[PDB]
Design a protein around this nucleic acid. Structure first.
Lengths: 257, 171, 146
RNA sequence: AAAUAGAAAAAAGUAGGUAAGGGAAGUCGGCAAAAUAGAUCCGUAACUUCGGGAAAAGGAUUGGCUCUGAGGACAUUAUGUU
RNA sequence: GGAAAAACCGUAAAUCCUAUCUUUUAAAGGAAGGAGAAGUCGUAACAAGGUUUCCGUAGGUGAACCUGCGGAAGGAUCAU
RNA sequence: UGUGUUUGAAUACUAUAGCAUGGAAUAACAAAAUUGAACAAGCUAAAAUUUUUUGUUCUUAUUUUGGCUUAGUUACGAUU
RNA sequence: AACCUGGUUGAUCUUGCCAGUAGUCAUAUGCUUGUCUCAAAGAUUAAGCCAUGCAAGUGAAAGUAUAUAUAUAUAUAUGUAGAAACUGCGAACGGCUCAUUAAAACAGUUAUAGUCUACUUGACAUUUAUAAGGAUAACUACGGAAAAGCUGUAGCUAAUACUUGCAUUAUCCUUUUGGAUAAGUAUUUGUUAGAAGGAAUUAUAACAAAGAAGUAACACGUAAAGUGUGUAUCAAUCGAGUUUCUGACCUAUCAGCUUUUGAUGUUAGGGUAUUGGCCUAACAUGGCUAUGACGGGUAACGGGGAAUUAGAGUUCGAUUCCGGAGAGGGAGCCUGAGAAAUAGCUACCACAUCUAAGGAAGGCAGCAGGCGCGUAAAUUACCCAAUUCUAAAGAAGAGAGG
């Protein structure tokens, strides 16, 4: 009749995935969970198609059934569980820790994170609500509630967040001069510093961002994620660091290696 | 229910298309009368429950001057703003004017003020006479067919005068 | 006078037991009328003291009819591009819009209307500013472009 | 009062009625008989010399009771008498 | 509490009666148009084609046409 | 002696409308004298400030601000 | 590849057509086909009909075993497997067709401060007690019918089927400590106070009334104090309903349309999940129309797109993705979070099957295959290895898919 569509075709599925034309009829469809469908990776894609620790979906199932992999200090066998923009995967058996980051080619990549530094993540809040007794809960990009947050923090602030206790290590006020990562839009998968904020009334708030090649571009506010400060980047970016080379420059650079 | 089968904005005529769906939605009207409490639970989309009062006699009436509420029987339905048929047939709606038993309110006023928290500014003489004779006019404000209860407020002054004139060549 | 209808006219946010009306601030370049604050009326379809949400698009049109009770009709005239000839053609659209009883509205007034919440079948918009003006000849038959 | 009365009550006659199911199949012939019909409100074609056709066709309604509304005349400057 | 069964509003299939529109499709018979064969009767048009032509029109004609009326030259006159 | 390595899976079109956005030209439109509006002065009714007696209430007034009436004064005010 | 020849004549230049000529993931057909890789394939004609088969199920740490099988300990105890059956969850996706539907559906672009949302995810609760109350299926027996996924009695007995129910915090006094007092989340009513959003009747806080549901009487097992299943509210997510603006083929041998009968506005109600003439009453007398309304046509699903393109364009878009429609025709429901579902049901009409002629059951535009239609279209093949989906989710299923 009508209701929930449970399938995702190969062609229909996000270009970000890198699921090739001949390689199947379908893609995996994500469970509801940490991030939106278009803005996430399931464990099947991560294990097989990125890491290549399995040949097939069955070999992924053989890895998953075991107690070996834990994400957010939680063991998971759930194949289509979505891992979102930024969080820490630990695989106990291989002793491996991966932090999820955007590539410059607009796809999600697992970037190796230090064993100690696996403890924490940097987490953007999307909204912050007052519940009964005038009692705060923050609501995160990764779909988590952080209860009892101090009123100093505001609705676009990022926060460094422990994974063991689930609570805040430090926080960064949203402002001009903060290192920002673009998460959707035209400029998707790049890092810059906020050059200027101008309010838009009744309509989309736009933010001006400067690259580290000293080039300035606009981006919509909703899809800019604060990621560090002018003083320092707050987390371990991959080597590219969101910096834009043009195709001619990039291909010449590739050739000159 | 559906609007697409009705006439076009120009006054034009539109062919019937799309066979009827569940979620266009719309069901028979409430018939709620005066009698001992009886209600049927109605199951709406998503498992959302509504309560269909089929009979009631005692609703929650608010004396809004002190802002206080007590449960009280309605003696009669006396005027209805929407049409004369509903009041004559005795079917409640959220703009019926009913008559309530004044005794819980009368007791509360006596307890609070000591003659007949609290504002204590003295009730108007016409309204006070009406409370004394038990013929207290009140307006229904909840939707009994949706919420399972007919709850209302005690009317006064300009609302009282308007509805009294509405209630009753000649004068 | 008032209340010609079968029912008393009141609206939420009157608050006259405590007495410390429901007039709004409305936002987005529209300063709420003094005539809403001080006016004799009370209403729900008024955007300046009703329960109306002034949301979505904000458009301009030209008033063509004031005949209907509490509700007014605007024509939005515009030029449509034809690619093959690389040229334009006149097109236009009639929008029935709530009037607001605070205002005076006449034919050939410019009015800035909002998308808001529709409360009736053909009515869509609600006036946010009435820019008083006039035009020669019949407004319904007149082409004014802006 | 009719140029009579009474009593009986079948045929038959004559002026009448009424008939199940069918519905012109009877008979030269729907002849006879019946159906229809008054008002108010609707609706009305082919066709026409545009005047009509037309009450076309085809429909609906109609009691009793208790009210409601509309239509005058006079005389106090908005109110009365009738 | 509770089956069958009824009654009341409300959806409302289907059926039939009209009314209007739509689509093919039948029909005796009528009256046109074209194609074909070097067909019959004239000699109409083409040259002043042996009454210069054509137009509008009306009436006549076995026709082709003819005559009248009023135009034009696309006339044979662009010359007293 | 555990642990291969470099990777690639680019770039762009993706309405005409809508959204944000810089704009000088070119167009439009509005502003635009049967006398109009820019200012100084005075008179005037409205509100607020400062004052100020009366125990959980409570008087009045100067003053200051906004609205409106009237003689003056601007490089005062109409393209062909 | 930004282009032309031949055809009115005795000969001529033109107008103008016809003819060649090239293409077409566009079909048929004729003849020919030594090869290999690649791979469209019953749309156009009948949204005509179907024989037979199959296409949606599910149990490997965690509801229910005296059918049964099996390893240990003193017939019985622990345990471990287990046909079956209740229970739970899914089958609303997919696959198929395009009759429709022409400002509708659809596309870009809004809005939802007008709402609902299972699974999943993260927050995380308030008005007999060494742990409850039975009753019901499979099962045993007798049975009935030609036949059927027809089912009748009586005896039982479980559940994670069904029904109950078992001291915690804050405020005031004492001063830390020690006393006293209270105590409903959604949702609804009446009274107010008033973090954030442009905008607030929103968050939130108080009052007076009502008020669901609830907060584990369930199952496993980490010492080289752990876990499953399941539960109210809140938010997320997978979505969905509405809803703004702008965008269409042909037609005037269709010029006035719409309003009894909601047409158009207003008011009041009712209904709905919610806005809404969505539905009713009352009141207005509107509303829409050459910038072509209103009809009528379409060999009309809409879009991303396809063909030819020097540039404009012109023709085409059943048809691999998306959105809609539809499942013989209409209509109506049930179940559930989600269906007006159609391998759900009911009725009517159109079809149509078995009958022992009493009665009974039915829906290929799923995949094969057949019939009819036609100029026109493949095998009742094998498999779940990959791709994914459904479950008590590894190991089973899937004509999805290969």
């Amino acid at each position: 009749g009508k209701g929930i569509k449970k399938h995702l075709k190969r062609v229909n599925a996000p270009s970000h995935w890198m699921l090739n034309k001949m390689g199947g009829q379908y893609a995996p469809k994500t469970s509801s969970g940490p991030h939106k469908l278009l803005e996430s990776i399931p464990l099947v894609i991560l294990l097989r198609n990125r890491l290549k620790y399995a040949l097939t979906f069955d070999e992924v199932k053989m890895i998953l059934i075991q107690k070996i992999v834990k994400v957010d200090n939680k063991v998971r066998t759930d194949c289509t569980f979505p891992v979102g923009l930024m969080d820490v995967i630990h695989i106990t058996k291989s002793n491996e820790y991966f932090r999820l980051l955007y590539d410059i080619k607009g796809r999600f990549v697992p970037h190796r994170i230090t064993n100690e530094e696996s403890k924490y993540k940097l987490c953007k809040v999307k909204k912050i609500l007052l519940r009964k007794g005038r009692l705060s809960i923050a609501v995160t990009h990764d779909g988590r509630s952080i209860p009892y947050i101090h009123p100093d923090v505001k609705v676009n602030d990022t926060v460094r967040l422990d994974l063991e206790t689930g609570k805040v290590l430090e926080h960064l006020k949203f402002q001009v001069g903060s290192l920002v990562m673009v998460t959707a839009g035209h400029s998707v998968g790049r890092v810059g510093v906020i050059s200027s904020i101008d309010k838009n009334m009744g309509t989309y708030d736009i933010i001006h961002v400067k690259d580290s090649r000293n080039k300035v571009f606009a981006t919509r506010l909703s899809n800019v994620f604060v990621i560090g400060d002018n003083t320092k980047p707050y987390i371990s970016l991959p080597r590219e660091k969101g910096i834009k080379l043009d195709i001619i420059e990039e291909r010449r650079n590739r050739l000159k290696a | 229910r559906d609007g697409r089968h009705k006439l076009r904005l120009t006054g034009g005529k539109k062919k019937i298309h799309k066979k009827k769906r569940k979620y266009e939605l719309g069901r028979p009207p409430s018939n709620t009368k005066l009698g001992s409490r009886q209600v049927h639970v109605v199951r709406g989309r998503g498992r959302n429950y509504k309560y269909r009062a089929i009979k009631l006699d005692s609703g929650s009436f608010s004396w809004p001057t002190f802002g206080i509420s007590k449960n009280t029987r309605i003696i009669d339905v006396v005027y209805n703003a929407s049409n004369n048929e509903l009041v004559r047939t005795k079917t409640l709606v959220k703009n019926c004017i009913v008559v309530i038993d004044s005794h819980p309110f009368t007791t509360w006023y006596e307890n609070t003020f000591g003659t007949t928290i609290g504002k204590s500014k003295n009730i108007d003489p016409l309204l006070l006479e009406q409370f004394k004779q038990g013929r207290v006019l009140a307006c229904i404000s909840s939707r009994p067919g949706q919420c399972g209860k007919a709850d209302g407020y005690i009317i006064e002054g300009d609302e009282l005068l308007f509805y009294k004139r509405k209630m009753d060549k000649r004068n | 006078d008032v209340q010609h209808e079968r029912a008393y006219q009141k609206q939420e946010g009157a608050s006259f037991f405590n007495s410390k009306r429901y007039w709004k601030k409305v936002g987005l370049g529209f300063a709420t009328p003094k005539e809403a604050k001080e006016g004799v009326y009370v209403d729900k379809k008024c955007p300046f003291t009703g329960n109306v949400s002034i949301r979505g698009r904000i458009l301009k049109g030209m008033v063509i009819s004031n005949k209907m009770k509490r509700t007014i009709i605007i024509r939005r005239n515009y030029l449509h591009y034809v690619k093959k000839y690389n040229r334009f053609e006149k097109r236009h659209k009639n929008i029935p819009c709530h009037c607001s009883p605070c205002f005076d509205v006449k034919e050939g007034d410019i009015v800035t209307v909002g998308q808001c919440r529709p409360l009736s079948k053909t009515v869509r918009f609600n006036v946010l500013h009435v820019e008083k003006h006039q035009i020669f000849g019949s407004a319904r038959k007149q082409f004014v472009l802006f």
